[PDB]
Design a protein around this ligand. Sequence first.
Ligand SMILES: [Mg+2]
Ligand SMILES: [Zn+2]
Ligand SMILES: [Zn+2]
Length: 1102
Amino acid sequence: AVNSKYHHSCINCGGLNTDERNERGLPCEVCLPEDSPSDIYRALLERKTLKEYRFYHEFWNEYEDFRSFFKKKFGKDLTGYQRLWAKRIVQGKSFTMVAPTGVGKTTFGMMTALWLARKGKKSALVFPTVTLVKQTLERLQKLADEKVKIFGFYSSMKKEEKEKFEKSFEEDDYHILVFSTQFVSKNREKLSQKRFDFVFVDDVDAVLKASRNIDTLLMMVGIPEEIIRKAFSTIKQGKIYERPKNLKPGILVVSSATAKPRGIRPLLFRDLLNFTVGRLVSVARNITHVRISSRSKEKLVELLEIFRDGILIFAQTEEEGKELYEYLKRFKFNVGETWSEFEKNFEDFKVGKINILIGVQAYYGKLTRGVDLPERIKYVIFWGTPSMRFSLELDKAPRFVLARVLKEMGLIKAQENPDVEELRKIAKEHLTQKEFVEKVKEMFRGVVVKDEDLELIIPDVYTYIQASGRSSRILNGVLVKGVSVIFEEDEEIFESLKTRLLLIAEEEIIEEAEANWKELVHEVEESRRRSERELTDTSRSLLIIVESPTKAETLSRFLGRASSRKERNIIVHEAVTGEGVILFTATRGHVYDLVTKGGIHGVEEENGKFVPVYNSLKRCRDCGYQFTEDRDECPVCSSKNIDDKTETLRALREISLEADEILVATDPDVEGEKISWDVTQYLLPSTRSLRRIEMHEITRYGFKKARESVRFVDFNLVKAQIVRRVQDRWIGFELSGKLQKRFGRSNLSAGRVQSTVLGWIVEREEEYKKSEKDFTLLVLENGVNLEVEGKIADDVVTVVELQEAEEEKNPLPPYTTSSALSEISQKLRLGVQEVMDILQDLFEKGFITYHRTDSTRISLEGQNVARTYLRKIGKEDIFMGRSWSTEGAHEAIRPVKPIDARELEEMIEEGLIADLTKKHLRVYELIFNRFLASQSAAVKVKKQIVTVDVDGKRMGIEQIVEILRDGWNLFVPLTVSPRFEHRTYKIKEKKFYKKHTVPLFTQASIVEEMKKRGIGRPSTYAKIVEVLFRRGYVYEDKYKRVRPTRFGVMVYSYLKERYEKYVTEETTRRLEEIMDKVERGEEDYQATLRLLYEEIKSLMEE
Ligand SMILES: [Mg+2]
Ligand SMILES: [Zn+2]
Ligand SMILES: [Zn+2]
């Protein structure tokens, strides 16, 4: 427990409670002075202070009642899906059923309607077919008790029962109504005037067929047509509609959408019932991808004798498809075809007659629209990578082919005017066929350019994935194991396919040699027979919490976001995986922060120790002002459009009641840990199952391996964060006020580091003029220019000493935050804050590792990434794996997927991936190259150290002349210089000036320095630098050099003349070091707090 207080943490009164009490699960001392009570509910009942815990107690009560009921009526207990479902149904939330078929959807609908009818509430069950009405009714009548009133309507209805139904429905007195969609579409107004408390839809597609049915259901749950028309108008407008808080709605449940939920009508559910009708898209796949070096049919047969039953073949075209058809039909295997008898052999294979079914790339990826049974297909064979081909001549080259060329050449920049004839003309005029193929193969990266057949090959990754997925699916709550074998002789196609497969599906392909066959087959058949056995349920619901929406957006992609619930201030997306359901939501920043209300600026002292007092943040969307105070209107713009984080907290606590285990996945640094604890402390009294995972990569591998290393909230990190925060608050406020005494402006001093840095710049403005010394440039004949002392007049250079050596050149270490923020803001004309934004963007999108790092460590994973890229590029021999530094928390900034920037641009042009801007791509190119250089072999060169004589003054200079063997120079350019002899050279033109020995500061220089002098940490640099500009203490110029303004110089001069002991570097580095010692648990928390308080106590009295 970190000794702190939180403003809106109490579970029962909602007021202020401490940290430890919420850590355990107890309300505040106002609600409950008892330290170790027997029961919270009972003890709060006896104190007459039970206010909000009643909701939780009765929640678990009613839920456990539901669970016992379902466990008694049905055979076994609720499953992992029905658990979340039940925990949602006792709250009265409307949602979408995200699950495969056969896990008890209809069953759960019936039992829910039965329980709710048992309580006294009336419900309705809508079905697509009348046969399902009859069946559901059948199952209900023989499981419902006599006290329940069940009625139904269908086409072939009994003579007296058909009118009995009408008479019953007319009475407005029922408990459960069961009918078709036809009934709803026909009896719109008849159903609109009734009011239910529960509605179940076993098929949402039939209902979504008409628009009037949506309004019908919304009128059935308890919403008037006027509010419906209003919301309809608002969503027609384009903006969302706030649901009236005074509205008490019913319960609507829909099965997963099979098609695409187009229309303006579905959004009504999103804005009124707080849920989206998401369609079931399951990326749940357990497929092993293996590739064979050639189209050797002998190997094919050899594998066919191992796989036996459960094989599927995909051939290039129907011609060669018929060729292989004939081949294996003549070798006497169980042959099949889907271009002639696509329906007969389908079911023949389905039963067990045919063992191997052969198809074509497009003939089966489109003509399996029936059922497509994945419990028979265990192995999918690809005879040639699924790809598209384009001829490159005069014509036949598509729009994009000429586009990418000419755009970089010089004709189509004119607002991108598309005209094929024109493309042909330009092709005739400027390019010859040779030059054309050259330029195309030069520009187009990531694809396969065949100059031989004049064909451009693009591996259809989508087709390969959709086809491969037919060997793996969630069958009876168990994800069977698939096997996909590719027969591709050309390494280029296989490599392209492998990269764009690693890009989307995040799946890899192994060579034939590194694959155990009998083992894999055994595992497949084992998964099959394990799926066949009686399903003892294992599915679970899972909750993941992130601090930024971007993260959740990029998680949804490789998780499989189907539906999206909107909970209060936040939006939580749900995805179906193999292990069960996974819920992920965004917090959008911090939740708690120190309040300036009372205490030492923000922290209250009691019993010697220090106690920070926090509160929920509110950011305005209009002006953008953030404040911790519990205001209704903004103190700046006086507008109500604020973003209260206590709403986010309450929402999260509501959601935590649904999930079984909850994981927090914030940033691996101290900030993310502080946030993680700020959340877990709030959720702890609710659900006692909270853990912490640290994702360094936002990918499948990153997520999974972050989960494999799951831990609890380390308190040292949190303590360090609190220490730094408190220091910033105290010192910042003190120096701010002391500056208010002298200049008048309110907010001035931001902290200590800011003062130190501004001091550096100010003193730099002085030590830049005095370091101005005379120099002259000397362009030498048949050599290079040479910079020397001011005034020379001998017009000759005499080489005195010359020696050559063969050194091996090692590359520069991988990008850390210092390296990146420096060299990227240098090579590009970008500010450090902007570069930091780009870095964070690349990280959260899942292209680079965690950017806030100060170590050069590289796991064998990243090394393997480098080696695999080099393997693709054809130059794997120049690879050298370097750990660089064993000690270090995070890996250095490196690309997570072996894909160069050009390949990425291609993937975006094609239409696969990104919302990536140009600067994003360039920065990624920078990191990619620096990293690969840091993972490539050393460069053998030959450098000479020449001591020349210019104007009677000996002067040495070392230079690289020749490159013996090329290594890492393929990524980072290594410059070579003309050789030097042991003779005398003539000076062509002397150029006299006086460039300063100590040049002025740049942003990259500032970062370089506060890294060098040990001031700050990766999560502060760009912030600290930007603070100077934002306050108005610093400006840039022609050379984009950092110069202090009049104001800044005045401020630092004043601070220097008065309070220097609190600004001096020797104290700043000391404090930073001590806090970093707190970060590891090597220095006391409360003690350092006491120190800060002491020096603050000293400073304040001036
Ligand atoms: Mg069903
Ligand atoms: Zn309380
Ligand atoms: Zn505002």
